[PDB]
Design a protein around this ligand. Structure first.
Ligand code: NA
Ligand code: NA
Ligand code: NA
Ligand code: NA
Ligand code: NA
Ligand code: NA
Ligand code: NA
Ligand code: NA
Ligand code: NA
Ligand code: NA
Ligand code: NA
Lengths: 179, 184, 178, 183, 178, 184, 178, 184, 178, 184, 183
């Protein structure tokens, strides 16, 4: 009877990304996505409630979503911020949904360095590049120009569910499964 | 143990002979004390030399820069004597003494250095910090090139990492003018 | 025999939301709701004992309750506060029950910011919007006007089980399964 | 080192020549000391200039504002000399010196700044704090615009994030009047 | 053989409430009670050894005991205090037992507030109400008048097993299963 | 960095001119110092005005109340000058100065406030604490209503949450009598 | 049904190396690789997201990858740095893939010593040797000369996915399984 | 618990008789005090001997090196008396006294030592630190070889690990000249 | 299917010793060795990546390797140091392998004592004896003389994989399973 | 509670009568103070006796050994008076007083002791530490055997563990010469 | 905050009238101060009485024993006045005052006590510690029996656990000679 039970979980083709984005979470999601892919090519639904976290962990989840054969649909819930947005934006525009009570936030990446000028300088060049890479990724998936994203992510750019729709992040706001 | 000999404490007594002891890490507090001592000694007699003993591992660049600018500001010649260790800002201050009046005791260690710092926050903030410390590095190298007689590129090359020197090596490099061995 | 046992748990169609509302709890509830939905379209009962917590986690549970096909019934127990209320109010009015020893509390959201004026200003605009969103959600589910909720949530607004009924939060106070 | 000289301590001796050393982070304690020193020096001789050396990373805005208002209150001209670092409230105080009597030593760093703060509690409390610090930002920018000769929008633009300046750039900017090298 | 083993545990229809009353414990008890209810309508025995704890968690367990169909019998053991008493008193008087080495304690609820007068005042009104609600609950289940309970719970009111019997908390002191 | 100038320290020297500096959070210690200074200055010359500079975020209500009662107790007029920040008990003390002799410097921040506190223990203890702080709030509002000329309800309304004011706003409100810009 | 499920995981022949490289992680990877090897000689895919960590743990994973019979393919994802690079470079050049959003970093090893000159001197010789060993390993797998790697790893040498390709670290940048 | 005696404190009183007490771990602070005392005593009378009592477990090599160089710098002979414990830099300073004027009390412990240090960061930084401390070790051994009369290899061998000595063993080794038992 | 899976793990006859040597690790290894011995007398392979640790725990693993009937082969990987070496050296010389990226270290044991002279003296005699026991064990397994080992372990004696071979620690350096 | 009396504080006043108070754990700091006091008193008048009051739980052996050697060094007889507790190094110092001039007050506790220490690092380092402390133990026992008149083996036996004694037992043992009851 | 009155502080001023304040827990530091004060006062005038005010919860037995022995050592009579609390070593010192000159203020609390201590290590070490503290207990009881006039067994019985007394009870018991109310 745990036969018909975890079979039921796996039949939903549903992955939950709730909380801080880190390498552990990236490992769980990767496993689940790879597992679901080998079962069938049917679509996968991802519910995202994330404030963000580790950008490289976000990159992995983003790239894995595009990597697997099955079409991935995303549903934003609660909030989707920073690295969370990167993950969210991995899905094709037609497949980017949001529940009504969700807010969205994009910003430039943050970090820290201590040491010699040379060390600081090296890490500065690196975070500038990262800022550019993420901004281009956002621009591309969203329809906005690179310079628009670049200007908006200067500070914390909060968007209500409706503004996220207008901005090109969210495609369709849904309340029901359609049922 | 800070002895008081007649009413004067030992550093106060030495200050009466125009001797300033810089014997700790340089921060805003130490800087303010040294600056005040320099300002006071010059007000008392702008004609007589000041003696700045340096035994410091360095510290805040801006703090040391206050001492540096005050050294050049006062009319009196500030002689610098390196003892024990003069590293980072300590060796910078040592090299900043009046021409021909920069000395080190025979076994004093001198160490020169690229600036150290930190940067936190968003990419923009980190860039602001990086640009700032790079600017600091460049003007520090420029002042050192000038005081030593070394070309800029040589200073930049030789301060890339911790560079330890004997008093003799410091003299050969242009950092100090001579080594004192005895009083006479 | 663990066959007839966890089958029995799942046959109850019952979800317990006890304690602080956070993303972990939101994940558990989401899993349980999605699991129960794929089994059948029979009603689901949720018992809530929560002081609240993370508002976005509360939003997720709220939206998930409305999202799934099965009708969800809520039973308030002990206390239902803040984000807990948001979850509670996801159910249709006819389906909002309370056990006798329960108290209810709505208030405006709280938070913190440190940094430059610009950063503080940005986060201030954001919490004002959140206050408005939640107040409208409460007003809508409850029957009260936006300005009434807005005025009442100024400070901690505690309600006894009977007052929560009068206010439009609770529909029916029950003691037994019938 | 807190050395003495004749039983005058070194800062007391410098105060006798109308020199005030502001060489730490500005808090209520430091502010009260500086204010008292300014008040005392003006009471002793309202005709002679006061010399305020500034080497501060900044600190409390209200604390610095006490010093600022006292500088304008006293009849004596308060000359400001920036050494080492004058950042935030430190550079604000530096710019607040008497006209034509604001100086910096050649290698002094000057940094200008948007106000920093915090807000905790309910949405109403956070809004109260946000409105308050925004008001503070706006009157600070206004005073700086006035002292530098820069238009308000320029100050607002240039203080959005940490803005580091050389003494020469500060002079260009109108934050100081001249660079001091010798005596 | 774990077939005939956990079947044996569940056949006892026995729930243990040992230790601090909190929301976690309330969740465990709720699950066990709901599980036992769906199996049959046979009586359930609860052994309570609790110093108390979180009042709202105690309220949930109290209300759940009354909510389910099966008759619940309680056996006090070691001590039953505060929120523990509330749980204990959920059972009908005929069903309230105690083991010989048990002591009982009722007192007024406790808490803390920090902030503005308004915030303190609000929370004060709330704890006064809670004190009244619990006192009435105790009075009702126990046979004592509201004012008697109100007077006695002023400070820690400790009762030996025999005094708890006289007071109307305990009905029958038992040593054996019979 | 608290200079001793001639031996008097700087605050002692200012006290000789009847100036009291209240420049920190108000607790029992600070209160006792201020009270003693007020008592001393009045004993020395009950005819001459006292000058109380206030730069305080507030603190203990009872501690400030000791200062308040002492201000009214002494025969001398206590002038109050707000500088930097006068919040909570600080602004209360500012408003408590002698009539026509309550001032603030142009950029001083004034903030008024409902009382802050805590309550722990059983319901009875919490009620005792609540009733106590409510009583405190009401007599504070009453004294403020009296000193400002505002009606009680206005004070109660305006102190419900942190209420920040410019010196000009404090003047139009009645918390201060005028703004001093220059020594004139 | 957990039959067809973990069978499915093991059928993927996929190992994930996410996070800090340490001896624990080396043990997990070793187990997985040895397990997969005894099942069949079919290729194994390793996804690496690692900032690096313990060099000797990295050495073990590197050597184990070469030790087993099955051909190992590596896919860099997120970042691959330090000890992570050593692991990545264990695969033959034809088998070194990267996902688009990945950056790469090589640098000299770091450490600490406290004690007598003799002790410090001994550990210094040791870290110089380690620096040389790793640099040669990088040079060999990458196509660059020892002196080029030696010069580049002087400080943190960050490479974008495209530069990592040019440098000889990454062979093919892929977006899809094909 | 530092007692005063006649406005001198006890160490100040002893300094008036040209006695310096080095009775703690050597750091930059202690070094600066000792250096100042040596400089002061020599300025007062370059003809009279100075007496440096040493009871130290050692400390910073550079700090001790400041004291060492100052001892040789001053014209006055610096006599060294070891009491209790003279270890590491303490015993180095003890051996550095004027020829024929290095003493220890009968039960004083002397310990000689290889330099202690640390190295952190990248391989390059660790190498820089290793080379530096090795250089320090070698010049320390050289100075000790010179002061004791032992060949370099003997010093290197005997300081490889903690080497404890009685006053008699130190005398026979060449570290001190004589054992002081009674007053002259 | 977990039938054919952990059967596969146990069929490898492989034990991993990764990380700090302590009594817990000694217990795991002992269990695994005893388990494998009762299954068959076929050889067992041990992969060691260890910086060392507790010498008595190392002694137990060493003695257990010799105690069981099956021939034990060791493969050094990453590093093998201190107590790790003792374990490594339990295998006969013909059976001591190393992967290419491994370094080796032998040194004298370390410890601490506080108390009276008598207590210190007692513990000193004990650590001298331990130093001697381990040095003899190393000498015996390695082919070197006691005085050679004794001289070399004075300080940290680091050996590259090739030097460890020359020294008699490692017998054969391998890259593949063959 | 450190009171002054006339410009002296109370210990300074007692020092003027040649009384030294050793009333704490013995470390390098305390040792240096006691040593300086002994050196000072002997310089002032080598003919008059010194009175060393001992109330100490002990401490550093080397630190106490500095005091011990100084006691024997000075020409003046150092009388020792044990009060309260004289344990470890405290009782060693008590026994070290001039012959016939070692006293204890009637209820003073005396405790004798094997040396305490520590050893960390490699086997070689631990052996070095063990050999060192054993050597210390043996010379301490030797000095005690000499001062008490007990045979070495008796001291070794009786200091194996904490050995508490009454003043009377200490006197029978030879640790002290007599007990003082009154000022007669 | 130790008030001054004229370079004398308040305790120094009271010491000039031969008054010693013992107003804290007794440790080696406090003991040394009290001992020095007693020694000093007796050196100045062996004929005049000393007044020792005691407000102490007790502390180190050996430390208090230094004070005790010094009290008996000095020629001057040491009067003891208990105020507030005299517990453990505090009450022992109170009872140790000169005969007929041991007083307490009316509301002073007196508490008597068995010795407190600790023992750590091997069985032998614990036995050594136990024997030592037992010996201490026995000689303390003996001295108390002597000062109070109570038989040894009575002291041993009555100090088994914390024994609190009023000033009146302390007088009846023999710990003090009389109660002082006024001057
Ligand atoms: Na896809
Ligand atoms: Na100059
Ligand atoms: Na629904
Ligand atoms: Na002015
Ligand atoms: Na029922
Ligand atoms: Na008045
Ligand atoms: Na392979
Ligand atoms: Na000399
Ligand atoms: Na075998
Ligand atoms: Na002598
Ligand atoms: Na007497």
């Amino acid at each position: 009877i745990t036969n018909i039970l975890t079979q039921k979980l796996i039949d939903t083709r549903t992955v939950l990304i709730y909380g801080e984005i880190n390498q552990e979470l990236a490992e769980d999601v990767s496993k689940q996505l790879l597992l679901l892919e080998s079962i069938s090519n049917d679509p996968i639904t991802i519910f995202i409630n994330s404030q963000g976290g580790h950008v490289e962990a976000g990159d992995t989840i983003h790239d894995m979503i595009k990597f697997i054969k099955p079409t991935v649909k995303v549903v934003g819930t609660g909030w989707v911020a920073s690295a969370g947005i990167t993950i969210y934006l991995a899905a094709e525009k037609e497949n980017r949904f949001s529940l009504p009570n969700t807010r969205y936030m994009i910003h430039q990446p943050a970090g820290g360095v201590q040491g010699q000028s040379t060390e600081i300088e090296i890490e500065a060049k690196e975070i500038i590049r990262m800022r550019e890479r993420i901004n281009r990724l956002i621009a591309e998936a969203t329809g906005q120009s690179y310079e628009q994203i670049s200007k908006d992510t200067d500070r914390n750019f909060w968007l209500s569910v409706n503004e996220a729709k207008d901005y090109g992040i969210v495609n369709e706001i849904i309340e029901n499964r359609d049922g | 143990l800070i002895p008081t000999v007649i009413a004067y404490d030992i550093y106060s007594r030495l200050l009466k002979d125009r001797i300033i002891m810089l014997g700790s890490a340089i921060d805003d507090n130490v800087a303010n004390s040294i600056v005040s001592q320099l300002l006071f000694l010059d007000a008392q007699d702008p004609e007589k030399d000041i003696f700045l003993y340096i035994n410091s591992p360095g510290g805040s660049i801006s703090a040391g820069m206050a001492i540096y600018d005050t050294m050049n500001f006062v009319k009196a010649d500030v002689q610098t004597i390196g003892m024990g260790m003069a590293a980072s800002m300590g060796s910078f201050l040592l090299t900043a003494g009046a021409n021909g009046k920069r000395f080190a005791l025979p076994n004093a260690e001198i160490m020169i250095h690229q600036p150290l710092g930190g940067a936190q926050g968003q990419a923009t903030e980190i860039e602001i910090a990086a640009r700032h410390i790079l600017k600091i590095k460049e003007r520090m190298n420029t002042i050192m090139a000038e005081k030593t007689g070394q070309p800029y590129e040589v200073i930049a090359r030789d301060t890339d990492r911790d560079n330890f020197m004997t008093a003799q090596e410091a003299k050969d490099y242009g950092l100090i003018d001579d080594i004192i061995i005895n009083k006479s």
